[PDB]
Amino acid sequence: SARSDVNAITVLNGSDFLTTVKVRGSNNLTDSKSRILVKQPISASSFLGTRISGLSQFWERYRWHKAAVRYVPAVPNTLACQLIGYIDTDPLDDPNVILDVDQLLRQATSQVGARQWNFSDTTTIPLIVRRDDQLYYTGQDKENVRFSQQGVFYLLQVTTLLNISGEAITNDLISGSLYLDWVCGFSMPQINPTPVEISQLTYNADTIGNWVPPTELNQTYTQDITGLKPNSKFIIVPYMDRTSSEVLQKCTITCNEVNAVGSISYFDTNDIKCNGYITFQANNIGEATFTLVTDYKGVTDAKPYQYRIIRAIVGNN
Amino acid sequence: ARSDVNAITVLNGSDFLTTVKVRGSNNLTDSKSRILVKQPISASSFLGTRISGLSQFWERYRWHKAAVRYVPAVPNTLACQLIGYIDTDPLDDPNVILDVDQLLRQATSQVGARQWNFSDTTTIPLIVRRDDQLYYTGQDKENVRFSQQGVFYLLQVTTLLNISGEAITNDLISGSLYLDWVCGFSMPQINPTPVEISQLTYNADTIGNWVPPTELNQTYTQDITGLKPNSKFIIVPYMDRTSSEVLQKCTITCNEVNAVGSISYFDTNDIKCNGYITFQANNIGEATFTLVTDYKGVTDAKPYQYRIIRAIVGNN
Amino acid sequence: SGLSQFWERYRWHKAAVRYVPAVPNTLACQLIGYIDTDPLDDPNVILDVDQLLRQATSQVGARQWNFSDTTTIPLIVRRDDQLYYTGQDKENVRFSQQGVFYLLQVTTLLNISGEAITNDLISGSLYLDWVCGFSMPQINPTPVEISQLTYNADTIGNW
Amino acid sequence: ARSDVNAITVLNGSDFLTTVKVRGSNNLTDSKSRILVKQPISASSFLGTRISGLSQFWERYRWHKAAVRYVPAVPNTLACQLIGYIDTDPLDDPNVILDVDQLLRQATSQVGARQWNFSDTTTIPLIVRRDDQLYYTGQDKENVRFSQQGVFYLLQVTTLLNISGEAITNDLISGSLYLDWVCGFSMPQINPTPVEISQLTYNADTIGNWVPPTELNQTYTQDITGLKPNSKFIIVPYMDRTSSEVLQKCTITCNEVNAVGSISYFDTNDIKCNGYITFQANNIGEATFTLVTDYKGVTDAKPYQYRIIRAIVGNN
Amino acid sequence: SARSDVNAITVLNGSDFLTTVKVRGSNNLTDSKSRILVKQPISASSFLGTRISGLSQFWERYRWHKAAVRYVPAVPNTLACQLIGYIDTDPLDDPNVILDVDQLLRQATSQVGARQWNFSDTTTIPLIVRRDDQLYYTGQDKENVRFSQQGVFYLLQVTTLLNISGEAITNDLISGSLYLDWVCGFSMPQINPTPVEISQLTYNADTIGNWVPPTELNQTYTQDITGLKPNSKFIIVPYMDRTSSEVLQKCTITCNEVNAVGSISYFDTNDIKCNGYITFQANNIGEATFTLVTDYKGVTDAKPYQYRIIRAIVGNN
Amino acid sequence: RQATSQVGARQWNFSDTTTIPLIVRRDDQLYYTGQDKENVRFSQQGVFYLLQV
Amino acid sequence: VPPTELNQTYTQDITGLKPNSKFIIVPYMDRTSSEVLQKCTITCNEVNAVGSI
Amino acid sequence: RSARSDVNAITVLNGSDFLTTVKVRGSNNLTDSKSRILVKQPISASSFLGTRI
Amino acid sequence: PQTIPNFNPIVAKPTVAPLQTNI
Amino acid sequence: PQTIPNFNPIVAKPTVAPLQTNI
Ligand SMILES: [Ca+2]
Ligand SMILES: [Ca+2]
Ligand SMILES: [Ca+2]
Ligand SMILES: [Ca+2]
Ligand SMILES: [Ca+2]
Ligand SMILES: [Ca+2]
Ligand SMILES: [Ca+2]
Ligand SMILES: [Ca+2]
Ligand SMILES: [Ca+2]
Ligand SMILES: [Ca+2]
Ligand SMILES: [Ca+2]
């Protein structure tokens, strides 16, 4: 009858679509960390609209019975590069810290499911299953990752691509895509809230900090903001409820990473000014780092400028 | 691994449909108000109830052992008999009937009908057809008999009463309806849902101005245009100007769904430019705002600035 | 499709859709193809590109390939035994169709040297190796249609 | 194909009989009012309950596992013990009994009797005779023991009470009676029901006149004759005349079952000749209407026109 | 016990009575559409008082196990004509559109259950059953017909009838009747409302349109009314709440089909007039087509005449 | 249409033969003899009606 | 043919047409008589008409 | 490289169908010898229309 | 050879119609 | 059942096209 009140394994199958790759050329390839181009976990609730991420906000646990990551080229055979991929089952064993490029690749053809292939053909990177009965939780990665993520797909580039005339290409280039056929088994019916649905965004605004003041007159120091989520896309706007006498000028600039939209300023003489907006995504540890440019003469500041953060609750974000 | 195989995947669960309110003496005139909720029973006819999100990833469904509960939120000191039947020709519409007698009589003749007072609970079942017919999934595009095994009607036999036996007049929320399903899906895929951007992006460039009057004190209905039909927004104040007079404004919104916020302005040796309001936009490209205008600078100094920030998401 | 007008009903016991290329391996574009069996929910209403390509592979009989090699996209039969009607639709479509072949384009074109091609082109052809079963002997009509005359005098001239 | 065969065709269902109201102190005098509903239990004794339309297509019935529910529409703060018994000699009439004691005592001695307070529910069964007797179908022509396996009585043991234990006086609706049957029919045919025309046809030719008075303002009771005994009708105004004065009439009906409508008249540079009234005709060939007479043309100009439209159907 | 709460097939049998036929003579027989004389579906809830239509407002689904349409003559053998019948299991394959008469008959001796016979003898036209488990709904045909109707009985005339002296008869003639022995199986207990019962008619009147005005002075243009049911029997009456100066005369006439009872007019000088009534049945697509006769002189009309529709809710209608 | 829905009815032109049978009950009621002088459902088992369509 | 009267709503017939066809009419003149001539003819067609002459 | 079978195989079919309805002349329409044929209908398989052959 | 059966068959059965039966 | 054979078949045969034979 109905109202079962029972827990049962439900095995499912399908195929999906990960993100397209983006091979690096020459003007974006000078370090070990450029050889690594996609760091992408292989959990369930880690995508948008794939039939495995949307289908996992309705159970609570999972276990990849057998998975495989399938590469498909989008290039002619007349182009030349070479890339390898491996799935590490210890998501906090990070290759972020290796410096010499050769060591970075030798620790990839050691994991027990690694492959190697040109970017003009196809091959399946399989996932390898621990010898236990462990069940991993769905949802966003909250405190520790060894509960949630069952693997991490690291694809990384060996060579540098090049045209038919041998001239190494300078810009980026799309070299195919990744699809992930899967078979997994879920256990506990419920709903995780972290991938909320559209028509429920709220635009929270209740976090009001304050910029630290300088000590000297001219300075371009920096500042960091903690307590934010490990990953999101925020926006800042200024906020000012103070007074002044002479100038009290200041000009904060965007954080020192990729995302940047504009600038922001503060200026409190008769030609007063308070405007700007910066967009960014917080680093994986859950903070950010700004840089300031202060050029006022008063030293007894005693009035730290206030700011604001706001975000849209629409999904994992 | 790839299989290219099709299977059934029987599932189970329980859900929340909606709440229920009963009509009083004043709102009860004839059969159109005798009915009070006409809610289809399909898989993809809910706002995130684990089946309207889970019957997005299959095309075809077929219930097995569905059932609908009623859970009250009233004491035993009130009574209004009500009935409930799940019809299976979804084009059958009781609104056509006009005599209340026959309206209550084509309702309990259905198989899975139950009759009860709204002070206690009752389970209404779903009676499944005989053949092997599988119902499509998606919204109701043009015809309904492909995509609904059933609808759900909840009626209101003779009016409320009280401890001393008199009919009250005010409307009243009574209980809530739940659902306990077992269904068999087939053919993995995704049905579409219109979505024009699938990743966050902020529209932090829009700009406008608020005109102050040449009057000492008066409230207005300053309007904004050039927006989407219906969406969410949020205003943030700012200023890139000059002034040397005692200005003051503490404007406020005029909306019903979302008016949670405040704004302030103050421009002298001390400053105040804090606040935020967030609102819904009616389907005109329109929004109403009211001013305060408690400043002494009767002469127009310079109009202030505001900015919307539209989040480019699935749809606003 | 002329010989099906002599039977009301049909059902594809099997089907498949070959891709017979026309180019060498010096031209590249992932293109993705599938057969949807709800012939009313269509992809044309989507307005982004990243969602259009992950509802095209989640289908259970989809294939992905560069357009310089072959493939076979099969038709995935239902579990029930519904027989679909013949003739042009003139109705709701879920009686007179069993599937719809969509073919997409996920990547831009690329040449021998890795630059994008500016102009469109044709790249191949598509066969359909089928099996089918018809039921009821009859003869459906042929739709004869004609639009009446309409004179249009709404332009003043000048000499 | 033709078979010329006779079979049983056991069926099942559930139905709605009627509602129930309990007598107060004032309406309760003796045994005649002690009983409150005397409703036969046959197949063809209802107004469209899936058995009074479905026991039209067979001559003979025989119940198997009938049963009668009671569903309340009152709180626990009221109490009046009531009993219920299905007797099987339909000529047994409790109205003959006069002492209330013996009246309550030939009622629970029946086999399928149940006794309960009217704040909760209870199922009364039907006890089927032993032999193979099949009861005819149709209305009760002249004798009843051919066409009723049972009647249903519902009594009222000692009067109502209240939260503080006092007997109230006003009448009160309490609950509703339902039915859950299983019966075996036989011999396919159709019983007749008097029907003089079996297809729509409108009688849009009748004509009449309304006399206005030679008085400035007065209300009348203008009557109409030459109609059927009891029927439905609808009036539509019209006019094929002339006038050049400020006329005005907004007449209205005088009926209780159907008075939903209005009529208007206005005849000058602006005109108004809209409205419709629909009514029932008492069993005289009669109908009462009232005028308004707010016009200034005291002199009789010309009487207006009206028209009934009888729909020639089964019976009006 | 009682209160089963179960769905069960109930097989039933009987015989019924369709409508008498009406053979066409000579003054009513010049087209392909005169050769076709009865277009009558073969569903269950498609009659009045037959024991199959009244018996089907009490279940919800059906399936003809085996049916047969039986012809019985009402004529002597000395009369001469010849007619054929067939049951098409695709109720939207319509022969309304064929023009040449011979094609109309060749597509009848192609369906797999067709017969041919003189109108002075008898023969059973059987129904043919699809190879599926499909169950068709009862009730009126609402949106699409392929759910409700399992067939359509088309009887159609080949020759022209004639007396013993060879003189072709000019008028119509009754050539027998049709009876329909049947065996069908219903599934779901319920009540459809569309065949309401007598003593519940209401005479609704809430639909108020308005006639479009002309543009010129003298004109006899036409107009159509949509939104009505696919089939019914309505009546119109005039409705006027406007003013006038000079004449504003107009005379609408009945629609251009069979049903017509009278006329209707409008005339708004001192000898004012507002009266009339037209009866009709809407076409199968659910509309109607009137024709007007306007003969007034004012051009700035700006006052479209109003009208009214009313109907009796007594049955399918 | 109430004359043919009966289960033992026949239809025919009046220039050929037929046989209209009597359809016996399922129970075993025995009917009494003599002229009715009463309700009729004791002393009769059927009634032959013949119509003209 | 015009009438022999000053003002008269004069009817006019046309012959030599098909039982059903979409025709159209256009005016022209080839002479005068040197006074005030004026006519604004209008149709009585059983379907529709666009304008007038 | 695609290709299909270079096989020319005979397939045989059976059945019947409907051809025409023949009308007969009388005395007014029977004047000459040309009004004495009353149907000429070719016998090619492709001459009919609405026959499944 | 290569012949589908029973494509579109027809079967005809004659009878008679006397002037009287005279049972 | 009731199935004519080889109605409209097709057969496909692949090959290759190298860049040099180098006999
Ligand atoms: Ca590792
Ligand atoms: Ca229903
Ligand atoms: Ca229905
Ligand atoms: Ca689909
Ligand atoms: Ca779909
Ligand atoms: Ca008794
Ligand atoms: Ca007795
Ligand atoms: Ca009877
Ligand atoms: Ca057909
Ligand atoms: Ca067809
Ligand atoms: Ca005797």
Numbering used by the authors:
A (entry chain B), E (entry chain B): 55 to 371
B (entry chain A), D (entry chain A): 56 to 371
C (entry chain C): 107 to 265
F (entry chain C): 160 to 212
G (entry chain C): 266 to 318
H (entry chain C): 54 to 106
I (entry chain C), J (entry chain C): 31 to 53
Paper passage:
Production is threatened by Macrobrachium rosenbergii nodavirus (MrNV), the causative agent of white-tail disease. The full-length MrNV CP is a polypeptide of 371 amino acids. Nodaviruses assemble T = 3 icosahedral capsids; 180 CP protomers assemble such that the asymmetric unit comprises 3 identical capsid subunits in 3 quasiequivalent positions termed A, B, and C (here termed CPA, CPB, and CPC).
Here, we present a high-resolution 3D reconstruction of the MrNV VLP, solved at 3.3 Å resolution. The asymmetric unit of the T = 3 MrNV capsid comprises 3 copies of MrNV CP; CPA, CPB, and CPC. We found that the MrNV capsid’s asymmetric unit is stabilised by 6 Ca2+ ions in a manner highly reminiscent of that seen in TBSV. CPC has a well-resolved NTA that allowed modelling from amino acid 31. Unlike the NTA of TBSV, however, which folds back to form an additional β-strand in CPC before going on to form a structure known as a β-annulus at the adjacent icosahedral 3-fold axis, the NTA of the MrNV CPC crosses the icosahedral 2-fold symmetry axis and inserts into a symmetry-related CPB. There is a large linker region between the S and P domains at amino acid residues 241–258. In the CC-dimer, this linker emerges from the S-domain β-jelly roll and forms a straight leg that is normal to the capsid surface. The interdomain linker in CPA and CPB, on the other hand, has 2 bends: one between residues Pro247 and Pro249, which causes the linker to make a right-angled turn, and another at Ile252–Gln254, which likewise causes a right-angled turn, restoring the path of the linker to its original radial orientation.
